[PDB]
Design a protein around this ligand. Structure first.
Ligand code: CLA
Ligand code: CLA
Ligand code: CLA
Ligand code: CLA
Ligand code: CLA
Ligand code: CLA
Ligand code: CLA
Ligand SMILES: CCCCCCCCCCCCCCCCCCCC(=O)O[C@H](COC(=O)CCCCCCCCCCCCCC)COP(=O)(O)OCCN
Ligand SMILES: CCCCCCCCCCCCCCCC(=O)OC[C@H](COP(=O)(O)OC[C@@H](O)CO)OC(=O)CCCCCCCCCCCCCCC
Ligand SMILES: CC1=C(/C=C/C(C)=C\C=C/C(C)=C/C=C/C=C(C)/C=C/C=C(C)/C=C/C2=C(C)CCCC2(C)C)C(C)(C)CCC1
Ligand SMILES: CC1=C(C/C=C(\C)CCC[C@H](C)CCC[C@H](C)CCCC(C)C)C(=O)c2ccccc2C1=O
Ligand code: SF4
Lengths: 146, 740, 83, 159, 143, 98
């Protein structure tokens, strides 16, 4: 992400012709944020504005999709198995011990995701959301102007 | 029966236990062999349950702990009063509150900080404050800095007195356990005495001091020639012209002619148009009625003179057939467990702080507070977060009581035992309503986002498209607007301008205007209900399953705060109730962040703004009814439409807010190490570093160890919460200062 | 509270009714603990003079209750336009 | 006389349920025992006919009322009905898959109605019995979808 | 013990209210566990899956869905009252198993009547590398 | 079972484990007699899971293939309608491609 942020911002300032802005703004991180993550995202989030919608609708939707999958990765990453097993046990008691649904019974017993599996799925959602949101932002920001 | 049982000199006053830092715990009394000894020292520092098993010493310890906290808060309040006395523009702000921004913190010119001394007006430079102390010092009639100096010195004196009181009441004269167990005397003395006496004293101060000062302040009289409140107190002639009922002179009070006091004990709905806050006469009658209600309620329980109520009898007498034994033993639990009372008090304190934030954003009780958007936003957000923290701590200490102080002997078929019995049903139904609320709030949001993205705005859940009109809230608004007409005929107007029909404005800016509720407000309110239901599910599940569970039957014997029971049963990580609170802290953070985002966006888009001759123009373009239905609309029109002043704050008075914003980003991002990772990798890295320090003989005598799993989770949640809170604080304050 | 006012008459009648109510059973005094129907006739401290249990706290509470009832009656009648 | 309303089932405090007025109410017990899924003596296809009829009649409503073509007159009432029929077919496929999955073995332990008297075996708990139940479900769902369709054609009120 | 005891169907059970935490469908399909003890008097204990239950003077019977619940109750009883109970396992077909000590004087003692099983005479860490046992089906610790 | 305090007997373990049908009756043919054979003959051709999985797939693939080929453009779905004149040029920062 750091190397692609550097590449995209330097090349974007080269294409726009204002290399002095990158030269005087890449020194401090607030300028990095303001002139990369905020300035170039103006065309990204206007994909399906309520007043008007244009061809960048897939890119804003994919940006928010990457945010959501990143957050689901956080859901798998912070919480660990052992609180989820008790909740799944309560859901087991809910399904097994209710009218009109105790007739339908699982064949594989619902168990919580194992710790290695938990780390793997958290990393998977993390990386999928990361890649999708960065691809969406990069393509939208570069293609909105040129 | 109720008496004062006090043991004199139980603990010698000496630095002998100060010499050895590890003395409260016998496990820590040996020595610091590992680096986890320090974290256990600072962790078990105030955990008085494992220090000793005697309840009397624990009660003395917590009594002097509360004394020390009271002294600390009094020191802080005295420091705030001293700052307002010395480094402030309160004299300038009194003569011009609508044009001079409040400022009470002055920085040093040491290293580039002179840019932080912003031009707040009145020939003064400093940090533009947001606590609203100037509004409070205008409500409670305060004119000069001499009075603030006197208040600060008195607060310092009372803080020293409180610290001396803690030292005395622990080391010199410590009360016995029967003194602390006098619950009826405690309740009577903190209902009639504390609350009632404070309410009556504040009502008297408002009537004799604050009412004439505020009557002369909004009339255009400069505060320099305003008479001091002792002149109003001693002399009836000066107070008679401002309020003609003082010419009677306490005659209507004893002769039951209280209708003659209708000039300064008024019953008016709305706000003062000159200042924008509530009428001080209304607050005077309010605090007087509150003092009455607490004086009558403080004589309910029976302590020593036969008459009254016995709480054990009240609890044991309320027994209903679907509950078996009804409140049978709760008096025995609440008189013997500090953590149960801590949970109850913290939950009610947090909820009441939430009510405090909501009812200050609704009715501003201070002059020139509604127009000061920064003070209102800061007060709402701050008390919002403090209430959330107190509620989460209530859940934590309830779980601690469940683990430690709960015993099955006294409770067999009472309410607590039956709540333990059907805990799976409660958790399953809460999970069902959790999933239901989550789907038909957030899936509605995602569906609106999709229909916006698919070019079909007529299929969205908006006001223009098919709508979910909040009919109940709007009906309550209409009822409260028409409440003074029929159900409260003695009220001048509506109790708040949330549901009114008029717009008040001070200094050309909107103070408080009617609030319209649409589909977006419905979506956000049900999002809030979903989020609060999830957080209460996590906390209640942690409390209920702290003792035993179908996974780990012996969780009671494993303590409250333990990392895991090993990788058995597929892995029982985070199974303790402490980890349930650890997750509930993040869920609290999400809940209150979305709540204050809704507050800021709704108030900036539909309440706050500058009034013009041609209609009322708000801070934003009134886009809450059009952009709060989608996630991308929320993002672009709240987090991106705003925060343009935070990024461009550099070189200005509010650049420190941008620095704080990025440091908060740093700390929020730094926490995810302690959240994602574990301990074995860090322990092995520490082993390699230990080898490096061993190679050239700088090996510490204390063995370096990685942080514990519970310690790592605590560090992660603390850094995460601190970063998120400071992020929202910096963004909110910079946006509301550079615009409002 | 002028001698002869209806408010004075209401106050005095309320005070006298409360002392009559607490004199012979009939009120949850210091002598009579209160169940749902207020029984069992206990005894603590001493009456200091007249019989039954009119202690220093018995006349203090009944005077307080009689005064507080009177404010409800007078202001209730004043609000509806009586006396 | 405490009136201990809340008691465990069959006086047994060891199992999951406790007999509660949500469960022990005569009206609720009579309504649940008279539902088709608990009529053990009735053939599972006759169970599925009524169950599919009720569910296919209810599932047509949201598709007509909140469908993408709800603003187009005359065509919403056909699009909602055929989408409901497709949903019924999807649910029938998943029902058949469940019947394959859960009845590849044989149950050995009975259900034991209260105070004994259990029948040999529920035909619904069998493989071919659940297949007949899913067949009745899809036939009932298709007929209910068609009935809700013709009820949207002839009408004195709304749709 | 000296003779393996068989649980009696006649024995009473402690008075308890309805608890959601208890026996599940695994008791019907798979095996379930049964705990027995003999009491001197009526005392109050806490079940590992529910709340508090007053037990009967004399023999008692508990049914637990897991063996961990049975041993948690056993440890609670032994710690609180020096009770020394025992639990069993009842299968789906009615087979009864005895898991709490077959020697009868608990795993804490030895009794000189049990044979060492899954014991390695080599030190921990002296095991061979997984390459030496690759494609053999036997783990280094299983040797 | 349940004489005075016992909840286990080992010969009626169907009662011991707690397997109880709280809502279960054995009343046969509650619907009128002429009504069954109309639906009994409805199911017998699709009673087999092979006949039902095929029939659902037969109505599945055919109606899915019907949609788009014939199902679309009769409902006027906004995917097979075409544009009027939108979005030939792209790029607000210049270059103006296509
Ligand atoms: C924004 C981030 C995020 C999100 C969305 C989730 C989502 C979830 N968490 Mg989690 N959580 C997170 C971060 C997050 N987590 C983090 C970081 C932590 C650590 C503190 C936790 C801690 C935590 C706890 C402690 C608990 C949860 C629970 C839940 C569930 C709540 C479900 C609900 O009511 O909503 C409804 C469902 C959603 C919002 C999911 C998205 C639904 C979208 C709109 C799709 C709708 C249907 C869609 C069309 C289907 C697609 C079909 C496709 C396959 C073809 C859900 C699985 C709770 C649980 O188990 O449920 C009670 C619970 O107890 N989480
Ligand atoms: C009418 C009498 C009275 C009053 C006013 C109070 C007031 C208070 N008590 Mg309480 N208390 C009383 C009687 C009273 N107590 C009795 C009879 C008992 C025994 C049953 C207790 C036992 C008790 C315990 C166990 C604890 C308190 C605590 C507190 C404080 C709570 C802090 C707070 O809410 O912020 C309000 C804060 C302030 C108003 C700041 C000003 C504090 C001033 C200096 C206190 C002055 C009041 C005092 C009664 C005056 C007489 C003391 C005299 C010897 C100097 C508060 C000051 C807590 C504590 O430790 O704090 C001391 C606590 O944990 N109380
Ligand atoms: C929605 C969630 C939910 C559900 C389904 C239940 C369900 C139940 N509770 Mg619980 N309860 C809940 C939440 C819930 N509770 C919460 C949040 C609390 C507060 C902590 C309680 C406190 C509580 C107590 C104190 C008791 C129950 C009892 C009961 C049972 C009787 C209810 C009944 O028929 O009343 C009648 C209902 C209608 C007439 C309608 C039942 C199993 C009782 C019990 O244990 O059963 C014997 C009992 O004594 N509940
Ligand atoms: C009425 C208030 C109150 C009281 C009297 C107590 C009292 C207690 N709690 Mg509770 N608690 C409270 C509120 C309260 N808590 C709240 C609001 C929360 C939610 C956050 C908790 C969460 C909580 C947990 C999760 C646990 C306790 C525990 C404890 C015990 C020991 C606490 C200790 O030694 O801390 C030692 C003091 C510290 C570690 C210092 C705090 C430092 C924090 C982590 C960071 C603060 C940073 C600050 C905000 C900003 C500074 C920035 C930095 C850059 C300088 C004691 C019984 C523990 C226990 O064992 O209970 C028996 C336990 O496990 N409590
Ligand atoms: C309903 C009528 C009634 C009421 C309200 C009272 C009330 C009272 N009388 Mg009593 N008294 C009563 C009937 C009553 N009595 C009767 C029937 C007799 C017998 C003739 C007495 C004889 C009596 C004596 C002799 C004394 C009192 C005293 C008192 C006071 C006791 C508390 C005190 O001053 O110390 C109290 C005000 C005592 C008093 O006021 O102390 C000076 C006192 O000395 N009274
Ligand atoms: C002679 C008997 C009498 C009468 C006629 C009244 C009449 C009244 N009193 Mg009063 N009161 C009485 C005895 C009486 N009271 C006594 C003995 C006490 C002591 C316990 C009180 C204590 C009392 C209080 C504390 C208050 C009143 C209030 C009122 C008003 C309530 C009715 C109203 O405004 O509409 C009906 C009003 C409603 C809100 C309807 C109630 C619907 C509920 C909330 C649901 C009315 C003027 C209230 C007042 O000031 O109103 C002007 C008030 O705050 N009274
Ligand atoms: C479009 C799907 C479809 C198909 C392919 C069939 C095909 C068949 N059904 Mg059927 N049926 C259908 C829909 C369908 N039906 C519907 C919607 C109903 C109303 C619920 C019925 C009710 C029905 C009954 C009651 C019977 C048939 C029977 C039959 C068979 C003879 C044809 C007949 O009498 O029709 C009608 C044939 C295998 C009969 C059969 O198999 O006799 C042995 C028979 O008994 N079906
Ligand atoms: C509008 C909404 C409609 C919803 C449905 C949409 C389309 C659904 C498509 C998926 C369903 C069928 C997928 C294949 C299922 C495999 C089942 C299978 O093997 O069936 C064999 C024949 O069944 C059969 O009937 C053959 C399988 C189905 C045909 C092959 C797939 C075409 C699609 C049985 O084999 P057996 O007789 O040896 O088994 C002995 C036990 N039954
Ligand atoms: C939504 C949550 C619904 C919970 C329903 C059960 C409440 C818990 C419950 O069963 O409480 C039982 C309670 C009556 O029981 P008793 O009157 O014997 O108990 C009263 C004593 O605890 C005092 O009924 C209600 O609270 C009715 C309102 C329920 C709402
Ligand atoms: C018989 C007798 C006698 C007599 C006596 C008497 C007659 C007495 C009386 C007494 C009394 C007659 C008393 C009273 C008291 C009262 C009180 C103590 C009350 C109250 C108080 C207060 C302070 C108040 C308050 C309030 C207010 C301010 C407002 C709200 C309400 C109320 C009202 C609560 C004699 C000794 C001569 C002789 C012998 C015998
Ligand atoms: C990083 C990390 C560590 C390693 C962190 C450790 C050992 C704590 C280090 C604390 C330091 C030493 C505190 C002091 C920090 C600086 C030395 C302060 C500098 C001040 C300047 C003025 C010099 C864990 O032990 C751990 C355990 C469990 C879960 C996650 C983690 C985890 O993420
Ligand atoms: S990963 Fe940590 S918390 Fe989880 S079971 Fe292992 S040691 Fe315990």
């Amino acid at each position: 992400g750091w190397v692609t942020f550097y590449w995209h911002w330097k090349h974007l300032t080269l294409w726009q012709g204002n290399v002095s802005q990158f030269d005087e703004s890449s020194t401090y991180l607030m300028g990095w944020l303001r002139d990369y993550l905020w300035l170039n995202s103006s065309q990204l989030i206007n994909g399906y504005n309520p007043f008007g919608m244009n061809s960048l609708s897939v890119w804003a939707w994919t940006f928010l999709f990457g945010h959501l999958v990143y957050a689901t990765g956080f859901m798998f990453l912070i919480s660990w198995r052992g609180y989820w097993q008790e909740l799944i046990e309560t859901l087991v008691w809910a399904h097994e011990k209710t009218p009109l649904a105790n007739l339908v019974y699982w064949k594989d017993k619902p168990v919580a995701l194992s710790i290695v599996q938990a780390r793997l799925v958290g990393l998977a959602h993390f990386s999928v959301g990361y890649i999708f949101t960065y691809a969406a932002f990069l393509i939208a920001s570069t293609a909105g102007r040129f | 029966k109720v008496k004062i049982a006090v043991d004199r000199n139980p603990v010698e006053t000496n630095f002998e236990k100060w010499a050895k830092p590890g003395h409260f715990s016998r496990a820590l009394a040996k020595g610091p062999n590992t680096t986890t000894w320090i974290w256990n020292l600072h962790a078990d520092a105030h955990d008085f349950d494992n220090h000793t098993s005697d309840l009397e010493e624990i009660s003395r310890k917590v009594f002097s702990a509360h004394f020390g906290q009271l002294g600390i808060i009094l020191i802080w309040l005295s420091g705030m009063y001293f700052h307002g006395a010395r480094f402030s523009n309160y004299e300038g702000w009194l003569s011009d509150p609508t044009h001079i921004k409040p400022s009470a913190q002055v920085v040093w010119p040491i290293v580039g900080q002179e840019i932080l001394n912003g031009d707040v007006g009145g020939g003064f430079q400093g940090i533009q404050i947001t606590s609203g102390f100037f509004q409070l010092w205008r409500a409670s009639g305060i004119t000069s800095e001499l009075q603030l100096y006197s208040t600060a010195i008195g607060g310092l004196v009372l803080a020293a007195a409180c610290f001396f009181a803690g030292w005395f009441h622990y080391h010199k004269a410590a009360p016995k356990l029967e003194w602390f167990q006098n619950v009826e005397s405690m309740l009577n003395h903190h209902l009639a005495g504390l609350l009632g006496l404070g309410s009556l004293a504040w009502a008297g101060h408002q009537i004799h001091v604050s009412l004439p000062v505020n009557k002369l302040l909004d009339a255009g009289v400069d505060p320099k020639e305003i008479p001091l409140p002792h002149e109003f107190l001693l002399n009836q002639s000066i107070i008679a012209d401002l309020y003609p009922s003082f010419s009677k002179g306490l005659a209507p009070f004893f002769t039951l002619n209280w209708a003659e006091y209708s000039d300064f004990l008024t019953f008016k709905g709305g706000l003062n148009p000159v200042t924008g806050g509530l009428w001080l006469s209304d607050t005077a009658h309010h605090h007087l009625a509150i003092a009455v209600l607490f004086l009558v309620a403080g004589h309910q329980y029976r302590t020593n003179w036969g008459i009254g109520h016995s709480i054990k009898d009240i609890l044991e007498s309320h027994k209903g057939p679907f509950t078996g034994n009804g409140h049978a033993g709760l008096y025995e639990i609440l008189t013997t467990s500090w953590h149960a009372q801590l949970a109850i008090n913290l939950a009610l304190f947090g909820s009441l702080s939430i009510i405090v934030a909501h009812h200050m954003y609704a009715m501003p009780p201070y002059p020139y507070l509604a127009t000061d958007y920064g003070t209102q936003l800061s007060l709402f957000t701050h008390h919002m977060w403090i209430g959330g923290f107190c509620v989460v701590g209530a859940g934590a200490h309830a779980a601690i009581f469940m683990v430690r102080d709960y015993d099955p002997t006294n409770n067999y078929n009472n309410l607590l035992d039956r709540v333990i019995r059907h805990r799976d049903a409660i958790i399953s139904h809460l999970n069902w309503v959790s999933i239901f609320l989550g789907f038909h709030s957030f899936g509605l949001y995602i569906h609106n986002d999709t229909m916006s993205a698919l070019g079909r705005p007529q299929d969205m859940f908006s006001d223009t498209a098919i709508q979910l009109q909040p009919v109940f809230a709007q009906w309550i608004q209409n009822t409260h607007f028409t409440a003074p007409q029929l159900t409260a005929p003695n009220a001048l107007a509506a109790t708040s301008l949330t549901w009114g029909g008029d717009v008040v404005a001070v200094g050309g800016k909107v103070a408080m205007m009617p609030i319209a509720l649409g589909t977006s407000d419905f979506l956000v309110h049900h999002i809030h209900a979903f989020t609060i239901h999830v957080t209460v599910l996590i906390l209640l599940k942690g409390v209920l399953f702290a003792r035993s569970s179908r996974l780990i039957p012996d969780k009671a014997n494993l303590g409250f705060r333990f990392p895991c029971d090993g990788p058995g049963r597929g892995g029982t990580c985070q199974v303790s109730a402490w980890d349930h609170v650890f997750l509930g802290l993040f869920w609290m953070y999400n809940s209150l962040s979305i709540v204050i985002f809704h507050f800021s966006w709704k108030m900036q888009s539909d309440v706050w703004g500058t009034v013009t001759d041609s209609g009322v123009s708000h801070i934003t373009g009134g886009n809450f009814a059009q952009s709060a239905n989608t996630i991308n609309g929320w993002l672009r029109d709240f987090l991106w439409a705003q925060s343009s002043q935070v990024i461009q704050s550099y070189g200005s008075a509010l650049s420190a807010y941008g620095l704080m914003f990025l440091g908060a980003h740093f700390v929020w991002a730094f926490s995810l190490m302690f959240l994602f990772s574990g301990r074995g990798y860090w322990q092995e890295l520490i082993e390699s570093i230990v080898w490096a320090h061993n190679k050239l003989r700088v090996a510490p005598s204390i063995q370096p160890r990685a942080l514990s799993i519970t310690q790592g989770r605590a560090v992660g949640v603390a850094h995460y919460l601190l970063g998120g809170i400071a992020t929202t604080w910096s963004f909110f304050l910079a946006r509301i200062i550079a615009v409002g | 509270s002028f001698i002869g006012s209806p408010t004075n008459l209401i106050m005095v009648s309320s005070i006298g009714a409360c002392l009559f109510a607490s004199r012979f059973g009939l009120a949850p005094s210091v002598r009579k603990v209160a169940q749902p129907l207020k029984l069992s006739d206990r005894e603590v401290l001493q009456t200091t003079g007249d019989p039954a249990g009119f202690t220093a706290t018995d006349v203090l509470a009944m005077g307080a209750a009689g005064h507080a009832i009177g404010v409800g009656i007078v202001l209730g009648l004043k609000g509806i336009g009586q006396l | 006389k405490p009136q201990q309303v809340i008691q465990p089932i069959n006086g047994d405090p060891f199992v999951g349920m406790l007999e509660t007025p949500v469960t022990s109410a005569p009206i609720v017990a009579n309504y649940l025992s008279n539902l088709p899924a608990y009529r053990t003596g009735v053939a599972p296809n006759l169970r599925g006919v009524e169950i599919g009829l009720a569910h296919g009649f209810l599932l047509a409503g949201p598709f007509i009322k909140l469908g993408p073509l709800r603003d187009v007159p005359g065509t919403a009432e056909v699009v909602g009905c055929m989408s409901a029929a497709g949903l019924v077919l999807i649910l029938a496929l998943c029902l058949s898959l469940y019947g394959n999955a859960a009845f590849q073995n044989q149950p050995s332990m009975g259900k034991k109605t209260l105070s004994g008297r259990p029948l040999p075996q529920d035909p619904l708990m069998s493989e071919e019995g659940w297949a007949k139940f899913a067949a009745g479900f899809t036939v009932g769902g298709l007929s209910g979808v068609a009935w809700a369709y013709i009820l949207t054609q002839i009408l004195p009120y709304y749709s | 013990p000296w003779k393996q005891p068989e649980l009696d169907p006649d024995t009473p059970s402690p008075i308890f209210g309805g608890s959601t935490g208890g026996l599940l469908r695994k008791a019907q399909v798979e095996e379930f566990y049964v705990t027995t003890w003999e009491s001197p008097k009526e005392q109050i204990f806490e079940m590992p899956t529910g709340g508090a239950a007053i037990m009967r003077k004399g023999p008692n019977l508990l049914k637990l869905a897991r063996k961990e619940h049975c041993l948690a109750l056993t440890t609670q009883l032994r710690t609180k009252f020096r009770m020394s109970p025992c639990f069993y396992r009842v299968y789906a077909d009615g087979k009864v198993e005895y898991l709490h000590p077959k020697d009868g004087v608990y795993p804490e003692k030895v009794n000189a009547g049990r044979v060492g099983v899954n014991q390695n005479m080599r030190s921990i860490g002296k095991n061979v590398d997984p390459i030496k046992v690759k494609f053999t089906g036997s783990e280094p610790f299983e040797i | 079972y349940g004489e005075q305090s016992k909840y286990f007997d080992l010969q009626d373990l169907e009662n011991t484990t707690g397997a109880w049908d709280l809502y279960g009756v054995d009343e046969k043919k509650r619907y009128p007699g002429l009504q069954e054979e109309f639906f009994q003959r409805a199911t017998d051709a699709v009673s087999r899971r092979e006949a039902l999985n095929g029939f659902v797939a037969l109505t599945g693939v055919a109606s899915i293939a019907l949609f788009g080929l014939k199902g679309a453009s009769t409902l006027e779905l906004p995917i097979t309608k075409g544009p009027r004149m939108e979005k030939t040029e792209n790029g607000k920062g210049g270059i103006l491609r296509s």
